[PDB]
Write a protein that binds this ligand. Structure first.
Ligand SMILES: CCCCCCCCCCC(=O)OC[C@H](COP(=O)(O)OC[C@H](O)COP(=O)(O)OC[C@@H](COC(=O)CC)OC(=O)CCC)OC(=O)CCCCCCCC
Ligand SMILES: CCCCCCCCCCCCCCCCCC(=O)OC[C@H](COP(=O)(O)OCCN)OC(=O)CCCCCCCCCCCCC
Ligand code: HEM
Ligand code: HEM
Ligand SMILES: COc1c(O)c(C)c(C/C=C(/C)CC/C=C(\C)CC/C=C(\C)CC/C=C(\C)CC/C=C(\C)CCC=C(C)C)c(O)c1OC
Ligand SMILES: CCCCCCCCCCCCCCCCCC(=O)O[C@H](COC(=O)CCCCCC)COP(=O)(O)OCCN
Lengths: 110, 431, 62, 51, 54, 110, 126, 126
């Protein structure tokens, strides 16, 4: 057999994102769950890079976020992509849940 | 052997063999299933069985004569066989069946019983013979809306609407002296045949058959006939190949011999020097396969057919087979090219030097009708021995690499994936 | 009706196939989409990597 | 008569030789792209007159 | 023909994609900075610095 | 062999984790240990003096250095936890060995 | 992963030599008695690792009378070790019985796999 | 998950009533035409969910001439929605053909499962 089917680690990737059987008639409302996986990767990555410059003491916290926005190179891109990214994360989830509520995805066997 | 052609108004070809104990005489016409339309599809198959009907064959068996016939896409044949010292009677019988008196054969009683016999052959073919009907459906989707798509036996829907007048119209337009070759094989001298024809003043019909509007055109396509009650999956797959009178005729034939034919239950067929067999035998993906290179007047096909019971590993069989085809463009060894030279010569020697004069009469007439003469077997061996590794790579990069495909299948083919997952395997691009 | 009669596809078929006419216009778009995505996936990487360099108030005290 | 290899042959090392430094060098045809935006090696960034 | 060398391999084409993206960034940036500064000319600092040089 | 190779990756990530946390104390050994280790990457030809100023965030072990070492130090323990999952998956397909070094499929207990 | 064809190539040169077979054979007899597999009730060919195709082929072709006796020796050995004991001195394998029952089946599986590779990557005389 | 025994219990009370069957039957005929499953080439019994044992039992017992025709209607429907079109007006299901071909097989699978539960948890008369 192919190597992507016999290897312990690639077999999981093949079964999930390559050879997984899908219904032919699903529409673009079935694309919101992949976006929510990109949102989580955006939010986690941008947070690690801001956490290197942050201070959590109550007398230093507010002025540390301004230090990110003024002194850090490309720091205003990191923050605004983070603050607006969370509003986009919640809007795609309300659409994901309302989808399953319309097409009956909550019923048995799911 | 040595052939000899003439033209005294009638084209006469002959291939004498002094070692044979029989002699065959017949006539081959240059029209077949590809010279029909969908309304009269099967009219050439009825002329075969009218010639082989019981009251006609009884007249032959009283003088020691046996009859045969064969229908293909580009030609048709009507042969008479006899002992070597009785070939004068063979020509007289052929005279009162085509040149004269083909109305006693098309009586009402003889046409209804013959029709009922042909409707039962084509029905049992479509329900029991799965390898051959999947290869017919391949021609029907690859060449759709062109003459080369029609089946040679006909269909059950077009056969029922054929009357006697359809048989007579087809004969006036195609059974012509301009479209005919008289052949002779076995123990018969070339000059004894032509003088026998000159002593009778024969003439079938004069000439100028129809024009045939459209040419053959290959289209990438698929047709699936799923049946979950049958116990196997039968699949065929091909690309566009070489016609006859092509320069790459023998290079395409040699590239099919590199992958060859397989039977899982024969022990010696598991030991062939074919690299594809190291992948298939680990999990036993198939029962048999065979690679073909078919050639017609206008186009051709190159590919393979398979049958299997592993209905869950179909995608691995199609994948591994198409990755070997890629090697013909990238990496093909000199050893693989010398093996295929030797076995191809053995394959062509058995076809052309069999014992049957009836098979040799069909090969001779089809070749003379389509290029004017017949190539010797000693000249064909020299062409095969002059093929290099560079010639195979140039042919494959034109005909195989990143090219469209035709597919047909029947049986348990749920595991056969979509067109574009298979189309993508025709180019490596890990490269 | 018979399975050997194929249905009509004349409303979707290109008059002249030209084997390299669908092979030139299809692959030019798949190449352009990979060229822009390899440049966009790089400006992204070097934007995050450059945040870890010295800040404006550290270079001033150099 | 035989051929030199440990289950990958110089058959497809010297046929793969035009490829395995071109397809193998297809990853610093990637270094044209992979390695700017920084003052690391500006000797070899802006040297082309398009650049 | 064109397809047998433009993109036949993808060592032909992942190297042409990558090499062509490096040249794209430079040519693309210079064209945007020239349009941006000319659309807002007279308001930038270099124009103000050239009007007080008395 | 694949189980042994994922283990060597765990060992590398655990040396890294322990080093970064010893620097979060900022004692006298914590400051001068980061000095002599980060200055070893200055010997790499043609990129040595640029990766050291990028690790430090400046021109010496200083405040950007300690704030980024703490944020990386919380992260890497969660990468180790994912290497451990991959490590167990490679053990389940063949199982464990035994001190005799022969097959164990003849005598098994749960 | 040294082949058995190579081990016997070296060994048969030592044994058929007069001067070499008197310095290395006494050394090799003390090496086997200090190892201690005979005290667990094992022959040497039981210790060979079997997670490879050449050893899976040799074990399929082993006769069943000898295959049933091998499985009992291996089960008895796993149980003598879970208890941290040795077997009685009259149940030890003796030197007469410590024979290579599996070596001949291995050497013919190796000579056939090598013959196949030499043919799969041959170049032609022409 | 309302049982079909209960649906027909209510429905047959409405239909055999003179005054009730003239206010709710016209309402129910407009409800079916506005739903639009007949325009995709579907009958109502194709829409019933089948991921439960009472519906798996009814489908095994369905004759095969009717089972082969059901699978074609379902495949044709997935393809018609994939293209965002409707079928031609002469391929729509008509009201004569919209018959409950699967209802009788369902009601006998339900009456047998209820009979079994009443016997599995019965108490004795003594
Ligand atoms: C921030 C993230 C952005 C993305 C979020 C939204 C994406 C999911 C929305 C679902 C959707 O696609 O809207 C369709 C919806 C219901 O209709 P349906 O499901 O039956 O048909 C789907 C068919 O596959 C279309 O796609 P179609 O098959 O018709 O053609 C392909 C289409 C590609 O367009 C897109 O990229 C759509 C994302 O071709 C073009 O448009 C070419 C451009 C000229 O009818 C509507 O139009 C409603 C619009 C959405 C309003 C609700 C949200 C407001 C808060
Ligand atoms: C606790 C959590 C509660 C969560 C509730 C959150 C509510 C806010 C969520 C906003 C998104 C809601 C949109 C509805 C999505 C469900 C799926 C859906 O409605 O699509 C099917 C519907 C039918 O039309 P089709 O032609 O596509 O037919 C296909 C099947 N019949 O196709 C359609 O999409 C209908 C056409 C588009 C309607 C757009 C109207 C505005 C929707 C609200 C958006 C937000 C406020 C403006
Ligand atoms: C699901 C993932 C996350 C969500 C939904 C989320 C949400 C938020 C929100 C809404 C804010 C306030 C934004 C503002 O108005 O400024 C914030 C701030 C912050 N978050 Fe995140 N966050 C996520 C992940 C992370 C992670 C993993 C980290 C650390 C590694 C992080 C670090 C920070 C920091 C340092 C701030 C303060 C700086 C700022 O205000 O932007 N975040 N987060
Ligand atoms: C967080 C670190 C680790 C964890 C949690 C872990 C966990 C485990 C567990 C539960 C087993 C099975 C039981 C056992 O054999 O004791 C195992 C086996 C094994 N581990 Fe680890 N391991 C770790 C690190 C390592 C490292 C650093 C190596 C080598 C460099 C390694 C190599 C192996 C091997 C070879 C085995 C199989 C031994 C056998 O079956 O005989 N592991 N590990
Ligand atoms: C229905 O068909 C589908 C389907 O369509 C899809 C898309 C998926 C896959 C869907 C997903 C949503 C994927 C899942 C994604 C996650 C669970 C995200 C989790 C991982 C992350 C968020 C990445 C975390 C990142 C890090 C640990 C590193 C970040 C920090 C860095 C790089 C700094 C490093 C330090 C220095 C100094 C450089 C399916 O599984 C599936 O089912 C078959
Ligand atoms: C972003 C946070 C990371 C969390 C996700 C973890 C992914 C890290 C990958 C680690 C690679 C481990 C390699 C060590 C073993 C090498 C020996 C070997 O032969 O094994 C390797 C295992 O390789 C992988 O694990 C990568 C698969 C993707 C995993 C998706 C779940 C053999 O498999 P593979 O084919 O992938 O590697 C050769 C490539 N041709």
């Amino acid at each position: 057999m192919a190597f992507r089917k016999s290897n312990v680690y690639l077999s999981l990737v093949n079964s999930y994102i390559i050879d997984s059987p899908q219904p032919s008639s699903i529409n673009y409302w079935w694309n919101m769950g992949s976006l929510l996986g990109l949102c989580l990767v955006i939010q986690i990555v941008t947070g690690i890079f801001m956490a290197m410059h942050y201070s959590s003491n109550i007398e230093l916290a507010f002025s540390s976020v301004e230090h990110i926005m003024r002194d850090v190179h490309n720091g205003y891109i990191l923050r605004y992509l983070h603050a607006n990214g969370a509003s986009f994360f919640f809007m795609v989830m309300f659409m994901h849940m309302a989808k399953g509520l319309y097409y009956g995805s909550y019923r048995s066997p799911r | 052997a040595e052939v000899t052609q003439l033209s005294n108004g009638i084209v006469v070809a002959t291939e004498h063999n002094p070692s044979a104990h029989t002699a065959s005489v017949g006539v081959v016409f240059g029209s077949g299933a590809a010279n029909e339309n969908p309304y009269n599809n099967g009219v050439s198959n009825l002329w075969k069985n009218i010639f082989l009907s019981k009251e006609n064959s009884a007249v032959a068996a009283k003088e020691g004569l046996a009859l045969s016939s064969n229908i293909s896409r580009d030609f048709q044949s009507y042969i008479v066989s006899s002992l070597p010292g009785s070939t004068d009677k063979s020509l007289d019988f052929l005279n009162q069946s085509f040149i004269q008196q083909k109305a006693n054969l098309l009586s009402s009683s003889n046409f209804e019983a013959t029709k009922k016999s042909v409707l039962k052959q084509v029905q049992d073919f479509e329900e029991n013979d799965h390898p051959n009907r999947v290869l017919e459906h391949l021609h029907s989707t690859a060449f759709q809306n062109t003459p080369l798509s029609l089946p040679t036996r006909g269909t059950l829907e077009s056969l029922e609407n054929l009357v006697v007048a359809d048989l007579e119209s087809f004969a006036n337009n195609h059974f012509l002296n301009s479209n005919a070759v008289v052949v002779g094989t076995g123990n018969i001298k070339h000059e004894d045949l032509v003088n026998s024809i000159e002593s009778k003043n024969l003439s079938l019909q004069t000439g100028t058959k129809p024009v045939l509007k459209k040419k053959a055109a290959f289209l990438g396509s698929e047709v699936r006939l799923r049946d979950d009650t049958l116990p196997k999956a039968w699949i065929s797959l091909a690309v566009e190949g070489e016609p006859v009178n092509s320069p790459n005729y023998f290079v395409a034939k040699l590239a099919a011999q590199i992958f060859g034919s397989y039977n899982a239950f024969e022990p010696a067929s598991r030991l062939q020097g074919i690299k594809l067999l190291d992948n298939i035998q680990e999990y036993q993906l198939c029962d048999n396969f065979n690679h073909f290179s078919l050639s017609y007047k206008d186009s051709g096909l190159w590919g393979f057919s398979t049958a299997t019971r592993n209905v869950t590993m179909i995608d691995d069989l199609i994948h591994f087979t198409l990755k070997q085809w890629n090697r013909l463009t990238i990496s093909v060894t000199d050893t693989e090219v010398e093996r295929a030279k030797s076995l191809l010569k053995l394959q062509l020697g058995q076809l052309y030097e069999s014992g049957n004069p009836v098979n040799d009469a069909n090969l001779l007439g089809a070749e003379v009708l389509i290029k004017g003469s017949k190539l010797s077997l000693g000249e064909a061996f020299k062409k095969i021995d002059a093929i290099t590794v560079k010639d195979v790579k140039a042919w494959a990069g034109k005909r195989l690499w990143d090219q469209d495909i035709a597919i047909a299948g029947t049986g348990q083919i749920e595991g056969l994936l979509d067109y574009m997952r298979i189309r993508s395997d025709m180019s490596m691009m890990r490269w | 009706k018979s399975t050997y009669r194929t249905p009509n596809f004349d409303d979707v078929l290109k008059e002249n196939n030209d084997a390299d006419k669908g092979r030139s216009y299809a692959y030019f778009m798949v190449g352009a989409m990979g060229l822009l995505s390899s440049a966009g996936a790089k400006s992204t990487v070097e934007t995050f990597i450059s945040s870890m360099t010295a800040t404006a108030d550290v270079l001033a005290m150099a | 008569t035989g051929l030199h290899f440990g289950r990958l042959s110089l058959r497809s090392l010297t046929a793969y030789a035009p490829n395995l430094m071109l397809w193998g060098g297809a990853s610093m045809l990637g270094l044209f792209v992979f390695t700017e935006g920084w003052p690391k090696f500006q000797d070899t960034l802006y040297k082309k007159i398009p650049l | 023909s064109l397809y047998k060398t433009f993109f036949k391999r993808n060592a032909v084409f992942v190297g042409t994609i990558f090499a062509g993206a490096f040249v794209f960034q430079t040519v693309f940036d210079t064209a945007i900075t020239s349009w941006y500064e000319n659309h807002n000319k007279g308001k930038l600092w270099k124009d103000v610095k050239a009007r007080i040089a008395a | 062999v694949t189980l042994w190779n994922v283990g060597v990756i765990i060992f590398i990530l655990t040396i890294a984790t322990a080093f970064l946390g010893y620097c979060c104390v900022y004692g006298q050994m914590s400051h001068w240990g980061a000095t002599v280790i980060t200055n070893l990457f200055s010997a790499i030809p043609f990129v040595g003096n640029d990766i050291v100023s990028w690790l430090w965030g400046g021109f010496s072990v200083s405040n950007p250095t300690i704030q980024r070492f703490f944020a990386l130090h919380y992260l890497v323990p969660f990468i180790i936890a994912a290497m451990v999952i991959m490590h167990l998956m490679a053990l389940h397909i063949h199982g464990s060995s035994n001190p005799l070094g022969i097959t164990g499929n003849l005598d098994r207990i749960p | 992963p040294q082949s058995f064809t190579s081990i016997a190539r070296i060994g048969d040169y030592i044994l058929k030599s007069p001067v070499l077979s008197k310095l290395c054979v006494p050394v090799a007899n003390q090496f086997i008695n200090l190892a201690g597999y005979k005290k667990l009730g094992l022959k040497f060919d039981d210790l060979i690792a079997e997670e490879n195709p050449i050893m899976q082929t040799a074990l399929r072709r082993l006769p069943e009378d000898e295959s049933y006796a091998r499985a009992y020796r291996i089960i008895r050995a796993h149980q003598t070790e879970l208890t941290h004991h040795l077997l009685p001195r009259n149940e030890w394998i003796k030197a007469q019985e410590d024979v290579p029952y599996l070596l001949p089946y291995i050497l013919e599986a190796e000579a056939a796999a090598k013959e196949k590779d030499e043919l799969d990557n041959i170049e032609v005389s022409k």
